[PDB]
Amino acid sequence: KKIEKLEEYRLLLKRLQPEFKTRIIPTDIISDLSECLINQECEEILQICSTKGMMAGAEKLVECLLRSDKENWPKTLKLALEKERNKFSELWIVEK
DSSP states (O other), rough: OOOOHHHHHHHHHHHHHHHHHOOOOOTTHHHTTTTTTTTHHHHHHHHHHTTOOHHHHHHHHHHHHOOOOOOOHHHHHHHHHHHHHHHHEEEEEOOO
8 A cells, every 4th residue: 555555545535525515524534633644734634624624524524535645544535434323435446
């Protein structure tokens, strides 16, 4: 699961932007997202969550993980989601 797969996760995140915004609750999945993503990004997402809403935040999240280069973010995405049993986890494709 090298950067090659990250390239995929990136584009893939761009693909599943619909699945993302409407499934993702970036107040929950954000918990582990702070692993790949730095606070400014993570709590940016949380900000949108709080100022806009969850879905809007999800659409920031998706971009912030596109902003990240640390292989963890897709895994962490689906992981944080697997914790919360979020519906996005089922759609999101990570190799684990």
